[PDB]
Amino acid sequence: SGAIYVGNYRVVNRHLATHNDWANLVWEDSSRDLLVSSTTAQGCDTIARCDCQTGVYYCSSRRKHYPVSFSKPSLIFVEASEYYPARYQSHLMLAVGHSEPGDCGGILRCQHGVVGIVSTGGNGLVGFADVRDLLWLDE
């Protein structure tokens, strides 16, 4: 689990969004595994606006932060799951590292702020749903 809090927005993995997220829906995209909902309290997370390919992510299944090199946002095939059928997930970045199902929502950060959140795993790999293109989060 895990989310980003920026201004009056809450950003979560779409497959883990609650009833409250859907009742206060701002934007959702199944192909990116993202959903944004509105909040009453203000958020202070800073979103990175960059093309960084190195950063640090939080891995709940290890209670550790790990530094990683990650790929550029792209369309990557994601095997079927209880949440989605087999499909290409867009805006996804991969890194070599640990990720098991309950790790989704862990934040990835570079020197400029929040890059995205854990969205895929297995095979000694970790996938992050990029959020740096969502310029409307800051305004």
Hey, which residues are catalytic here?
Answer: 15, 33, 104
Measured from the CB of residue 52, what is the shortest distance to Zn ion in angstroms? 3
Q: Does 89 bind ligand A1B5E (CB under 6 A)?
A: yes
Q: Does 61 bind ligand A1B5E (CB under 6 A)?
A: no
Binding mask 101-120 for ligand A1B5E (x = CB under 6 A): x-xx--------------xx
Helix and strand numbers, DSSP H then E, in the chain: 1, 10
Beta strands in 16-134 (DSSP E): 25-29, 34-44, 54-59, 64-69, 74-78, 87-96, 107-110, 113-120, 125-130
Given candidates 22, 81, 88, 136, which one binds ligand A1B5E under the rule CB under 6 A? Answer: 81
**Rounded Cα distance, 56 and 65, in Å:** 6
Q: Which does 89 bind (CB under 5 to 8 A by kind): Zn ion, ligand A1B5E, none?
A: ligand A1B5E
Torsions phi, psi for 102 (to 5 deg): -65, 5
Given candidates 25, 50, 75, 125, which one binds Zn ion under the rule CB under 5 A? Answer: 50
Three-state DSSP class for residue 18: coil
- Give the binding site for ligand A1B5E (CB under 6 A): 15, 33, 78-79, 81, 83-84, 89, 99-101, 103-104, 119-122
